[PDB]
Amino acid sequence: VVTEKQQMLEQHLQDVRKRVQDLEQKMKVVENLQDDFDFNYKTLKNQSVTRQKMQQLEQMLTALDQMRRSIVSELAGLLSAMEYVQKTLTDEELADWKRRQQIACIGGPPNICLDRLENWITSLAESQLQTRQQIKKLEELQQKVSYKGDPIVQHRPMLEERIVELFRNLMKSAFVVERQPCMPMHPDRPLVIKTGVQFTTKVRLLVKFPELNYQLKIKVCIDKDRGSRKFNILGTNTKVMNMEESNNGSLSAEFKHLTLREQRCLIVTEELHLITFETEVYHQGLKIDLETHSLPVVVISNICQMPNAWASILWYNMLTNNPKNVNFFTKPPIGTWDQVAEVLSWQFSSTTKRGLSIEQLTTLAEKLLGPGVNYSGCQITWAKFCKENMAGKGFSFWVWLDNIIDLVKKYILALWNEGYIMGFISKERERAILSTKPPGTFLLRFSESSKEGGVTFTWVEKDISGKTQIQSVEPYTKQQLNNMSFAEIIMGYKIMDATNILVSPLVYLYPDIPKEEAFGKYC
Ligand SMILES: CC(=O)N1CC[C@H]2CC[C@@H](C(=O)N[C@@H](CCC(N)=O)C(=O)NC(c3ccccc3)c3ccccc3)N2C(=O)[C@@H](NC(=O)c2cc3cc(C(F)(F)P(=O)(O)O)ccc3[nH]2)C1
């Protein structure tokens, strides 16, 4: 859906194009008048005929001055308009995309489409090129015909400085990282790169100029620049930018043959690195030095470091919009619960068909902050999330959660995707909602004491005394889920009753779904 700010920008660019086109027509008229003045001056060098020709030349030069004074001020007004629209385009519309990319990287909505910004940037770039050519024409015209108090000699140096500044800054802003450094075997985990592993990245120039096809050589490097590890990019670290049908005519450069190796003559998962891209543009007498960099990258040595490395990327991209804060973990910022809850639900909605529900997020809030009702005014630190182990446990909240995400993705995906997994429910709440329900009613949830991840089912029944009993089964491990599906385990589960007969204590899946109707399709 196109916004009000974006529709106003589309008209503001169209108005710039109309102004540029209107000045082109004035430039033609001023050139033809000067060419006539130049011709008539150089030629015919009663006696009244010479006097009449002299009056013609004076009138033509006075008219030349007025047309020049008009064009110069019309160009000054055009540049001011260009400056405003460029600030809206680069500092506002482009920055929003950069933030939308940070969010998409960490599982957020996958918007981040360049086609509209490429169309707007190209339009502004083409308009600025015609303006630069009009300022070049004023220089050419002045050289041939000038006079004391000529508006070209006094205002052209400022007009030239203004358009050159505009065009350089637009070219520099258009050089973006379309696809952030990522390992192809871990597409759901970008900005985490293991040494010796082939990784890919992609860059794009949003100024759609066909002149530049096969002209820009993109050089890629790491650690360009206290006590931090230094690395080198090995493989094919140079790529010629080209227009493809696959890109829809867009100028881009994809690096697929890259690897990191430590250079040879703070904790590893919190150390950040920047992958830099460089090129030089030579366009009609201008040398524009383009330089862009990736979002901070965590460099790992073993794949066991992947969970803590991903948490550092989650923290960085959730809390800051700054694209180069390498010292972020020297003093990491605090997050709100609503910020964290959004990211945690993104971890599930990017890997599965279902994110985290309100009830699942509430029980997750209580696990980190303790009892309460409203968690919107609560704060979560890096220590409570990843750096330090949970209160009374030998593992951090993130390690416990990452093992659940993996359990869902690899072992119980189909059940999670259909909504048969209660997942996160406190011992007090599960006993509460089951207390009212008939005997044999059960819910599926994850283990809180299991580091590696465990799945369980909590059920309700009545003893001979009539007292309601709520029990959970010993959590089923990943190893067990590799032999039997959780659905087969639910159906096959038997208990020894009072009559000493093996019976299934499971009848209905919460709230009232008969077990065979919900889990039969998976056996
Ligand atoms: C007390 C009771 O009424 N129960 C029945 C009896 C006991 C004893 C046997 C055990 C059981 O049913 N085991 C399962 C296998 C479970 C597994 N993880 O592999 C089972 O099917 N047992 C069979 C059997 C038969 C042959 C060979 C092996 C096992 C069985 C069947 C019939 C009779 C006996 C045994 N069986 C149980 O799990 C009983 N419950 C527990 O022991 C238990 C629940 C629980 C919950 C958590 C948590 F919520 F996730 P957290 O957030 O981490 O705190 C953590 C630890 C936990 N332990 C349920």
Task: Give the start-to-end residue ranges of the domains of the chain.
Answer: 3-175, 176-302, 303-424, 425-523
Spatial contact of 421 and 415, defined as CB atoms under 8 Å apart? yes
CB-neighbour burial class of residue 507 (10 A; exposed 0-12, middle 13-18, buried 19+): middle
In a 3-state reduction of DSSP, which class is residue 307?
A: helix
Top mutation candidate among 472, 494, 500 for ligand 1, by most atoms within 8 Å of CB = 472
State the Cα–Cα distance between residues 318 and 488, nearest whole angstrom. 39
Please choose, from the candidates 476, 497, 487, the residue with its C-alpha nearest in 3D space to the C-alpha of residue 522.
487
Resolution in Å equals 2.7
Spatial contact of 220 and 239, defined as CB atoms under 8 Å apart? yes
Spatial contact of 181 and 165, defined as CB atoms under 8 Å apart? no
Please choose, from the candidates 337, 343, 292, 341, the residue with its C-alpha nearest in 3D space to the C-alpha of residue 316.
343
Q: What CA dihedral angle connects 213, 217, 222 and 225, to 10 degrees? A: -110
- Structure tokens of 347? 């971890």
Centre of ligand 1 to C-alpha 359, Å, is: 26
CATH number of 176-302: 2.60.40.630
Q: Check if 426 has its Cβ closer than 6 Å to any atom of ligand 1.
A: no
Centre of ligand 1 to C-alpha 476, Å, is: 9
State the Cα–Cα distance between residues 100 and 107, nearest whole angstrom. 11
Atom of ligand 1 nearest to the CA of 448: 52
Evaluated on CA atoms 256, 259, 265, 268, the torsion sign reads positive
- The distance in angstroms from the start CA to the end CA of the chain is 44
State the Cα–Cα distance between residues 202 and 314, nearest whole angstrom. 21
Q: Is 425-523 assigned to CATH 3.30.505.10?
A: yes
- Can you identify the CATH homologous superfamily of domain 303-424? EF-hand (1.10.238.10)
CB-neighbour burial class of residue 320 (10 A; exposed 0-12, middle 13-18, buried 19+): middle
Backbone angles phi, psi at 381, to 5 degrees: -95, 165
Residue position matching structure tokens 């360049």: 114
Cβ atoms within 10 Å, residue 321: 11
Residue position matching structure tokens 């009539």: 466
Atom of ligand 1 nearest to the CA of 454: 50
- Structure tokens of 21? 């086109």
Please choose, from the candidates 477, 415, 471, the residue with its C-alpha nearest in 3D space to the C-alpha of residue 452.
477
C-alpha R_g of the chain: 34
Centre of ligand 1 to C-alpha 474, Å, is: 4
State the Cα–Cα distance between residues 197 and 299, nearest whole angstrom. 11
Q: How is the beta sheet containing 286-293 ordered, strand by strand?
A: 238-240, 217-222, 275-283, 286-293
Q: Check if 400 has its Cβ closer than 6 Å to any atom of ligand 1.
A: no
Cβ atoms within 10 Å, residue 180: 19
Centre of ligand 1 to C-alpha 495, Å, is: 9
Q: Check if 447 has its Cβ closer than 6 Å to any atom of ligand 1.
A: yes
Spatial contact of 457 and 518, defined as CB atoms under 8 Å apart? no
Alpha helix ranges (H) inside 285-426: 306-319, 337-349, 358-369, 382, 397-410, 413-418
Q: Check if 81 has its Cβ closer than 6 Å to any atom of ligand 1.
A: no
**Residue 301 backbone class (left: φ over 0; alpha: ψ -120 to 50; beta: rest):** alpha
Kindly provide the b/e burial profile for residues 50-61, where b requires at least 16 CB atoms within 10 angstroms of the residue's own CB.
Answer: eeeeeeeeeebb
In a 3-state reduction of DSSP, which class is residue 126?
A: helix
* Alpha carbons within 13 A on the beta-carbon side of 118: 17
Residue position matching structure tokens 């800054």: 169
State the Cα–Cα distance between residues 14 and 381, nearest whole angstrom. 48
Q: Check if 474 has its Cβ closer than 6 Å to any atom of ligand 1.
A: yes
From residue 10, give the alpha-carbon distance in Å to each of 85, 93, 111, 361. 10, 12, 20, 41
Cβ atoms within 10 Å, residue 436: 10
Q: Check if 423 has its Cβ closer than 6 Å to any atom of ligand 1.
A: no
Q: Check if 475 has its Cβ closer than 6 Å to any atom of ligand 1.
A: yes
Alpha helix ranges (H) inside 145-232: 151-174
From residue 384, give the alpha-carbon distance in Å to each of 192, 247, 371, 387, 398. 22, 43, 16, 7, 9
Centre of ligand 1 to C-alpha 419, Å, is: 24
- List, in sequence order, every beta strand (DSSP E) within 97-235: 175-182, 192-194, 199-205, 217-222, 231-235
The experimental technique behind this entry is X-ray
Atom of ligand 1 nearest to the CA of 502: 32
* Alpha carbons within 13 A on the beta-carbon side of 50: 4
State the Cα–Cα distance between residues 239 and 206, nearest whole angstrom. 17
Question: Helices 115-144 and 48-86 meet at what angle, rounded to 10?
Answer: 150
Q: Check if 449 has its Cβ closer than 6 Å to any atom of ligand 1.
A: yes
Q: Are strands 379-380 and 502-503 parallel, antiparallel or unpaired?
A: unpaired
Please choose, from the candidates 267, 477, 272, 310, the residue with its C-alpha nearest in 3D space to the C-alpha of residue 398.
310
In a 3-state reduction of DSSP, which class is residue 143?
A: helix
State the Cα–Cα distance between residues 234 and 257, nearest whole angstrom. 8
- 202 Cβ neighbours under 8 A, 6+ residues apart: 177, 178, 179, 252, 253, 254, 255
- 11 Cβ neighbours under 8 A, 6+ residues apart: none
Q: CATH second-level architecture of 3-175?
A: Up-down Bundle (1.20)
State the Cα–Cα distance between residues 365 and 393, nearest whole angstrom. 17
Q: What is the residue type of 196?
A: G
From residue 212, give the alpha-carbon distance in Å to each of 185, 215, 218, 283. 33, 5, 12, 8
Atom of ligand 1 nearest to the CA of 495: 32
Q: Check if 484 has its Cβ closer than 6 Å to any atom of ligand 1.
A: no
Q: Check if 479 has its Cβ closer than 6 Å to any atom of ligand 1.
A: no
State the Cα–Cα distance between residues 181 and 237, nearest whole angstrom. 13
Residue nearest to atom 15 of ligand 1 (CA): 474
- 2 Cβ neighbours under 8 A, 6+ residues apart: none
